[PDB]
Design a protein around this ligand. Structure first.
Ligand SMILES: CC(C)(COP(=O)(O)OP(=O)(O)OC[C@H]1O[C@@H](n2cnc3c(N)ncnc32)[C@H](O)[C@@H]1OP(=O)(O)O)[C@@H](O)C(=O)NCCC(=O)NCCS
Ligand SMILES: CC(C)(COP(=O)(O)OP(=O)(O)OC[C@H]1O[C@@H](n2cnc3c(N)ncnc32)[C@H](O)[C@@H]1OP(=O)(O)O)[C@@H](O)C(=O)NCCC(=O)NCCS
Ligand SMILES: C[C@H](C(=O)O)[C@H]1CC[C@H]2[C@@H]3CCC4=CC(=O)CC[C@]4(C)[C@H]3CC[C@]12C
Ligand SMILES: C[C@H](C(=O)O)[C@H]1CC[C@H]2[C@@H]3CCC4=CC(=O)CC[C@]4(C)[C@H]3CC[C@]12C
Ligand SMILES: [Cl-]
Ligand SMILES: [Cl-]
Ligand SMILES: [Cl-]
Ligand SMILES: [Cl-]
Ligand SMILES: [Cl-]
Ligand SMILES: [Cl-]
Ligand SMILES: [Cl-]
Lengths: 392, 396
């Protein structure tokens, strides 16, 4: 009546740019394709079928329109998967896709389910940030609200000033994210984790042409130089972050298949990883997005580990300053941080990214035959998710 | 080869707001204030017997269906901050439609079982006066589904009628049930059965044009109760042309929140808090889309099977009264003693703030087990997207 949760499979779509390669897919189609993909992948060398999954939990931030009404469920049904499977959609802002994994692991630990999928979706081309708040944003908080909680761009600058991070510092970091992303793609590091996705071809306007083709690669990569980044214009007046040093607006989905260990064996699936420690903590509202400092501290503490014990770190590149702040505090070996690039180069479909990072981290641990990875993300509402996973 | 750092999740406290009618007693409260007040209330209730404080909570998980406007942007977190509670506590909001508030409890118990947290709050909120059903879908609802969608999934009112036809349920059948819901709720209230579980809430009063008067009042009663008779019910006009369900046999549109404080058993004891209940079995299953809301049949079956129990082993059942036919259909299949079903009334009389109800039902069931010195309760709810949540809880 108690479970031992392990990851048995993980996959993700390539990540499309805004109005890009995946923008012709209904949000429910994009998530549905990735849910089905993780099941199909597990099915190749086992007898596992979609009907064996008991619950799906998916992260999604802007739960409006195509992404409202429990997209995790609507996606499952839209993809033609079995109706008896339960589904829930969760929102802790950009932490959502990561928390989705924590939550599935918990249901397995409790003996509630033996097989579950944790996933994440965001189709930002079709449902943009703030679509869920309505036209008068003043209305979404109570009159009494008196917390200095800045928007994401102001946050990035407040964090930069807090650490003495310059335009030079962030441009250097943004260059390196593009370089590592390109290296990963040139070497084929993402081949295992990606499920290529069929998508409608768009004419030069954004109407479908009738064409439907496979999309293989992350669209956000582009040739980048220090000089080129230096010409970029800051999002805010007096700011240091530009499009070249901020996460991209993107479309994508990711899914991770979890099982109780003994049940994995019965299905003939190999346990690949487990959670050593997990957390979702609150951060300092003034800075808003400096929470990775706290979530990292918390999982290290729970695991009885130090930053040096970790082989691979995935810290979401919401903005360059978020990562540089975390680094100044935790003093990691940066050769171990976002080794295949991050959201500055690869994109950040907000509700997807948490599951995407767990997927990317696991595959990098396997590629290099290493053991421990830390995943940490800043999140809206001054929150941060953290996970330490270990290979089995 | 390995074993674990696990928790044993138990409920230590549970409370709910009174449930207001649409544009009613609670309609003047911002949704974040209504939830925040109940979050704070469940923490305060524990603090009486202990040194537990809000900062000791590690995570909050809250259910909410229509996550638009006041209810968007992770209302669980916004509510916590708005009520002045400590910033370091994490929060997540969840959506499995009407199942949300119940699944919130399942998920907190999961995090404790996994050893992720020692202290958590499961909750639910819906301010339907301020954020109505469908506000999250946008102007044209055909857009929220892919062109390929070809599933015969009906709206909730069509579902209630399909379920009636599935079981041969008549207008008389549902009217008898609706009457009994009002009668049981009125008896429960008259006897003060709900006094323990209710946290009174201060609410700005709104006039008839829904504008504030400046007056604030303490709300402590469920607003949905009203004098009901078989003759009165028989006069009501069905919601759908040729249907059997009316306002008198359907759940009410309502405002409310509820919250349950969970801990690892050992941590509960360390704080001098008595463990009050645990989950025997929990589930969230998919239901048949054609009928949509008949899923309590399946979720009940699943938890009974996992628990190794029969319906006859259950002392108290809370099955959400989304529509009379949902409950009567479930009863026709599972054959419960109806004297044990919704003993203090249900959503037809008490109201149904959709995201709140799952937590509300656990709160109500626990308190009734305690009141009658009984052991086992089943909670089961139908949900949009053809889903259903089930829980068997047992007193400790
Ligand atoms: C930063 C942001 C505002 C940029 O939006 P954008 O201006 O539409 O982005 P673009 O792709 O058009 O890039 C702008 C310009 O920079 C250029 N550029 C972008 N990346 C470049 C690179 N690596 N090298 C050289 N030039 C680059 C573009 O070519 C473009 O050039 P232009 O002068 O011809 O317009 C947008 O990405 C954003 O909002 N990101 C964050 C989203 C978010 O908040 N997520 C949540 C996190 S907390
Ligand atoms: C059923 C429903 C449509 C009724 O809405 P409504 O008509 O605005 O509700 P009202 O309170 O105004 O009641 C309607 C009438 O019935 C009467 N009525 C209600 N309960 C009564 C009772 N117990 N005895 C006698 N009359 C009653 C009212 O007085 C009213 O009279 P009137 O219309 O002639 O003025 C509405 O409650 C509803 O949509 N419920 C479901 C919401 C939902 O979908 N939840 C999710 C479920 S899956
Ligand atoms: C998903 C992101 C994350 O968690 O990384 C979070 C972080 C900061 C969040 C914004 C804060 C300001 C704001 C005020 C409104 O009234 C509407 C919603 C927005 C635009 C917010 C949208 C979500 C954001 C981008
Ligand atoms: C919360 C309820 C529950 O879980 O009991 C569910 C049950 C049926 C759901 C409706 C189905 C039809 C529909 C079509 C749309 O285009 C927009 C959304 C609505 C209005 C749905 C809103 C939520 C409802 C009422
Ligand atoms: Cl099946
Ligand atoms: Cl603010
Ligand atoms: Cl750097
Ligand atoms: Cl192709
Ligand atoms: Cl480059
Ligand atoms: Cl306190
Ligand atoms: Cl009649």
């Amino acid at each position: 009546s108690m479970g031992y949760p392990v990851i048995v499979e993980a996959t993700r779509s390539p990540i499309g740019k805004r109005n890009g390669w995946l923008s012709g897919l209904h949000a429910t189609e994009l998530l549905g394709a990735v849910q089905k993909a993780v099941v199909d992948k597990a099915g190749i060398q086992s007898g596992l079928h979609a009907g064996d999954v008991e619950q799906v939990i998916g992260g999604c931030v802007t739960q409006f329109g195509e992404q409202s009404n429990n997209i995790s469920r609507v996606a499952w049904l839209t993809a033609g998967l079995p109706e008896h499977v339960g589904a829930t959609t969760v929102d802790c802002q950009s932490g959502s896709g990561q928390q989705a994994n924590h939550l599935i692991a918990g249901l397995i630990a409790a003996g509630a389910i033996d097989v579950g999928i944790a996933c994440g979706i965001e189709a930002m081309s079709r449902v943009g940030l703030g679509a869920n708040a309505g036209p008068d944003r003043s209305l979404i908080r109570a009159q009494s609200w008196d917390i200095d909680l800045p928007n994401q761009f102001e946050a990035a600058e407040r964090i930069a000033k807090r650490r003495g991070i310059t335009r030079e510092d962030v441009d250097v970091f943004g260059l390196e994210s593009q370089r590592r992303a390109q290296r990963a793609w040139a070497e084929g590091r993402f081949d295992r984790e990606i499920s290529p996705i069929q998508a409608p071809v768009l004419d030069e306007q954004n109407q479908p042409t009738g064409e439907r083709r496979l999309v293989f690669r992350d669209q956000g990569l582009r040739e980048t130089t220090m000089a080129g980044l230096g010409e970029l214009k800051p999002v805010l007046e007096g700011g240091i972050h530009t499009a070249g040093t901020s996460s991209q607006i993107s479309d994508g989905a990711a899914a991770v298949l979890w099982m109780d260990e003994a049940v994995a064996r019965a299905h003939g699936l190999t346990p690949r990883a487990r959670i050593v420690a997990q957390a979702l903590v609150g951060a300092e509202p003034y800075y808003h997005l400096d929470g990775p400092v706290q979530s990292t501290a918390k999982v290290l503490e729970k695991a009885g580990m130090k930053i040096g014990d970790i082989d691979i770190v995935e810290i979401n590149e919401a903005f360059a300053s978020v990562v540089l702040s975390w680094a100044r505090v935790h003093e990691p070996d940066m050769d171990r941080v976002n080794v295949n690039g991050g959201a500055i180069a690869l994109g950040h479909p907000v509700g997807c990214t948490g599951s995407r990072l767990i997927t990317t981290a696991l595959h990098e641990l396997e590629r290099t035959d290493q053991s421990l990875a830390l995943i940490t993300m800043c999140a809206g509402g001054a929150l941060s998710t953290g996970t330490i996973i270990e290979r089995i």
